[PDB]
Design a binder for this molecule. Structure first.
Ligand code: HEM
Ligand SMILES: [Mg+2]
Length: 453
């Protein structure tokens, strides 16, 4: 078959379609119009956007297709280097670091992180316990404080102390501002224009701020010899079983910057969208609050108790189904191949998986794809293979998935145990896009249930 293509802009082809603050929502609208596959052209590049489970299952065959670095990740590589997220599968450092870090991210390894996750979660609950009657909560802002602080403590035993601040720690300001530069670089008609000399100087400054902190903490840890429950201790001590080599200090720095840069925002967006869906769907809020009350019977949650929050886990999977917070990933054809029996591809051709549209495939999910129904995930053996992919695919799938889901389960369970929530503004969903998705402006009021910590 011949391939559908959205509207074009002369010699700029389709490129201006992405000159928007909300490009993935734009592409989802295009997908709705054009169907399971469409071509997208820009000066010097071409990709094909996939939306159906039928085609994405094929794209996810690792014998045929491998991870490609899409446009904003190639710029993120300027500060995350050959850390796990911005390396190619075939670079030595990718596999070395994957083999070293995998056991440190396993479900079993969560038992070792649990206490530092509860440290930051208790800080969030005390913050909200201490609001006055007429105050409200800025939900994505607080979730972001929580997720940055939790990855800082678990990643490198460092406190960003985000709940002590309106202006984040300078490392966070630099990283946030670097991620924004990466995104903003994509939308520049004249990348070399002198108007951007300032953005380029600030970008180098921010890279320097990030490296200087992380390098110093690494050096401090080597100089002290201290052994903590964090990823930095694991990286200092670890050898790749296959090569026999450890990670060098530069790459350990890239991994630390990568866990913060890749993980914080997608996890804070998940928590913010799950609370959004529960305040809009009070019967599901009640089910999840009843479960948190029945299960979280102790003043702080244990690892075992967090595992028993099945309905909270169902709520978080259904929020990932609707708004997977790292919404698109890119692949390339390893050799010439035919996609879906219809679309011939040459070696090197690019594909993009649009995960919000895969999760709205009506042939898989049924017709009510916009409705929030946690019970879709009651028994996850019902879900066909390759239908639900919020954490990507295969060996290049999110290494932080058990971390994110333990964090979000813990924190949402505690939120639901300790407070009732009110959507006092009747908030209108407005999804902001960075590297990730979140509900911008989402606010609520909490009313404490007056349960001790
Ligand atoms: C709900 C929260 C999260 C979601 C939805 C999510 C989603 C994703 C997705 C879709 C990918 C694949 C990207 C691609 O193919 O280009 C990815 C990769 C990755 N994520 Fe996550 N992520 C989340 C949380 C985290 C956290 C908490 C961490 C770290 C503590 C993390 C670290 C990573 C890394 C290091 C990669 C690269 C893995 C590799 O290629 O070896 N993520 N994530
Ligand atoms: Mg309903």
């Amino acid at each position: 078959k011949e391939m559908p293509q959205p509207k074009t802009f002369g010699e700029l082809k389709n490129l201006p379609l992405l000159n928007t603050d909300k490009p993935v929502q734009a592409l989802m609208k295009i997908a709705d119009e054009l169907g399971e596959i469409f071509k997208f052209e820009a000066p010097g590049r071409v990709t094909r956007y996939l939306s159906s489970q039928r085609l994405i299952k094929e794209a996810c065959d690792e014998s045929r297709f491998d991870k490609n670095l899409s446009q904003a990740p190639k710029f993120v590589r300027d500060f995350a280097g050959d850390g796990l997220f911005t390396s190619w599968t075939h670079e030595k450092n990718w596999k070395k670091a994957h083999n070293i870090l995998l056991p440190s991210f396993s479900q079993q390894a969560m038992k070792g992180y649990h206490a530092m996750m509860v440290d930051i979660a208790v800080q969030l609950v005390q913050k909200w316990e201490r609001l006055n009657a007429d105050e409200h909560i800025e939900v994505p802002e607080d979730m972001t404080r929580l997720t940055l602080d939790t990855i800082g403590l678990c990643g490198f035993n460092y406190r960003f102390n985000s709940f002590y601040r309106d202006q984040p720690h300078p490392f966070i300001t630099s990283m946030v501002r670097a991620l924004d530069e990466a995104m903003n670089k994509l939308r520049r008609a004249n990348p070399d224009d002198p108007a951007y000399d300032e953005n380029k100087r600030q970008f180098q400054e921010d890279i320097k701020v990030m490296n200087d902190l992380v390098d110093k903490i690494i050096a401090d840890r080597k100089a002290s010899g201290e052994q903590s429950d964090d990823l930095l201790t694991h990286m200092l001590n670890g050898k790749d079983p296959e090569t026999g080599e450890p990670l060098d200090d530069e790459n350990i720095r890239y991994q630390i910057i990568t866990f913060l840069a890749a993980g914080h925002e997608a996890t804070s967006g998940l928590l913010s969208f799950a609370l959004y869906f529960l305040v809009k769907n009070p019967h599901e809020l009640q089910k999840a609050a009843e479960e948190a009350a029945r299960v979280l019977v102790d003043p702080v949650p244990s690892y075992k108790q967090v595992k028993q929050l099945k309905y909270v886990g169902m709520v978080l999977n259904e929020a990932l189904r609707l708004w997977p917070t790292a919404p698109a990933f890119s692949l390339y054809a390893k050799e010439d191949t035919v996609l879906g029996g219809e679309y011939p591809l040459e070696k090197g051709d690019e594909l993009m998986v649009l995960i919000p549209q895969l999760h709205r495939d009506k042939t898989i999910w049924g017709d009510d794809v916009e409705e929030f129904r946690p019970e879709r995930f009651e028994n996850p053996s019902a879900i066909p293979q390759h239908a639900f992919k919020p954490f990507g695919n295969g060996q290049r799938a999110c290494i932080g998935q058990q971390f994110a889901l333990h964090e979000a389960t813990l924190v949402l369970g505690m939120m639901l145990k300790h407070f009732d929530f009110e959507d006092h503004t009747n908030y209108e969903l407005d999804i902001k896009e960075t590297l990730t998705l979140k509900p911008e402006g989402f606010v609520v009021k909490a009313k404490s249930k007056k349960i001790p910590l």
